Amino acid sequence: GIVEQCCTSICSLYQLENYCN
Amino acid sequence: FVNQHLCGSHLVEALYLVCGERGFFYTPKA
Ligand SMILES: [Zn+2]
Protein backbone atom coordinates (compact mmCIF):
# COMPACT_ATOMS: atom_id res chain seq x y z
CA GLY A 1 0.00 0.00 0.00
CA ILE A 2 2.51 2.33 1.44
CA VAL A 3 5.91 1.57 0.08
CA GLU A 4 5.41 1.03 -3.63
CA GLN A 5 4.11 4.32 -5.03
CA CYS A 6 5.73 6.44 -2.40
CA CYS A 7 9.26 4.90 -2.56
CA THR A 8 9.33 4.76 -6.32
CA SER A 9 7.83 8.25 -6.74
CA ILE A 10 7.67 11.03 -4.19
CA CYS A 11 4.73 11.57 -2.02
CA SER A 12 3.58 14.81 -0.96
CA LEU A 13 2.13 16.05 2.18
CA TYR A 14 -1.46 16.36 0.82
CA GLN A 15 -1.18 12.78 -0.60
CA LEU A 16 -0.02 11.32 2.76
CA GLU A 17 -2.77 13.37 4.51
CA ASN A 18 -5.05 10.61 3.10
CA TYR A 19 -3.20 7.84 4.93
CA CYS A 20 -4.33 9.28 8.23
CA ASN A 21 -7.06 7.93 10.40
CA PHE B 1 16.39 -5.69 -0.37
CA VAL B 2 17.24 -2.47 1.70
CA ASN B 3 15.93 0.85 0.00
CA GLN B 4 12.30 -0.20 0.49
CA HIS B 5 13.02 -0.62 4.24
CA LEU B 6 15.05 2.58 4.53
CA CYS B 7 12.32 4.56 2.78
CA GLY B 8 9.52 3.21 4.97
CA SER B 9 11.46 4.70 7.90
CA HIS B 10 11.24 8.11 6.27
CA LEU B 11 7.56 7.52 5.02
CA VAL B 12 6.41 6.81 8.60
CA GLU B 13 8.04 10.02 10.00
CA ALA B 14 6.27 12.18 7.30
CA LEU B 15 2.92 10.34 7.91
CA TYR B 16 3.40 11.08 11.70
CA LEU B 17 3.99 14.78 11.04
CA VAL B 18 1.12 15.17 8.48
CA CYS B 19 -1.63 13.15 10.20
CA GLY B 20 -0.77 14.61 13.57
CA GLU B 21 -3.86 14.33 15.82
CA ARG B 22 -5.72 11.56 13.95
CA GLY B 23 -2.89 9.06 14.43
CA PHE B 24 -2.28 6.67 11.56
CA PHE B 25 -2.05 3.10 10.29
CA TYR B 26 1.06 1.76 8.79
CA THR B 27 1.19 -1.57 6.94
CA PRO B 28 3.98 -2.34 4.31
CA LYS B 29 2.19 -4.73 1.79
CA ALA B 30 -1.24 -4.61 0.04
ZN1 LIG C 1 17.53 7.08 4.69
Specify the resolution in Å. Answer: 2.5
Hey, what amino acid is at B27? T
Element (H, E) at A18: none
Q: How many other CB atoms are found less than 10 A from the CB of residue B27? A: 9
Method: X-ray
Q: Name, in order, each residue with C-beta under 8 angstroms of B18's C-beta and a sequence gap of 6 or more.
A: A13, A16, A17, A20
Amino acid identity of A14?
Y
Backbone angle region of B27, left / alpha / beta, with phi > 0 → left and psi within -120 to 50 → alpha: beta
CB distance from B8 to chain A under 8 Å?
yes
Q: Residue B14: which region, alpha, beta or left (left: phi > 0; alpha: psi -120 to 50)?
A: alpha
Q: Which of A6, A13, A21 sits opposite B11 (nearest CB)?
A: A6
Query: B25–A6: do the CB atoms touch at under 8 Å?
Result: no
Do B29 and A1 contact (CB within 8 A), yes or no?
yes
Q: What are phi and psi of B24, to 5 degrees?
A: -165, 180
DSSP category for residue B12: H
Cβ atoms of residues A2 and B9 within 8 Å: no
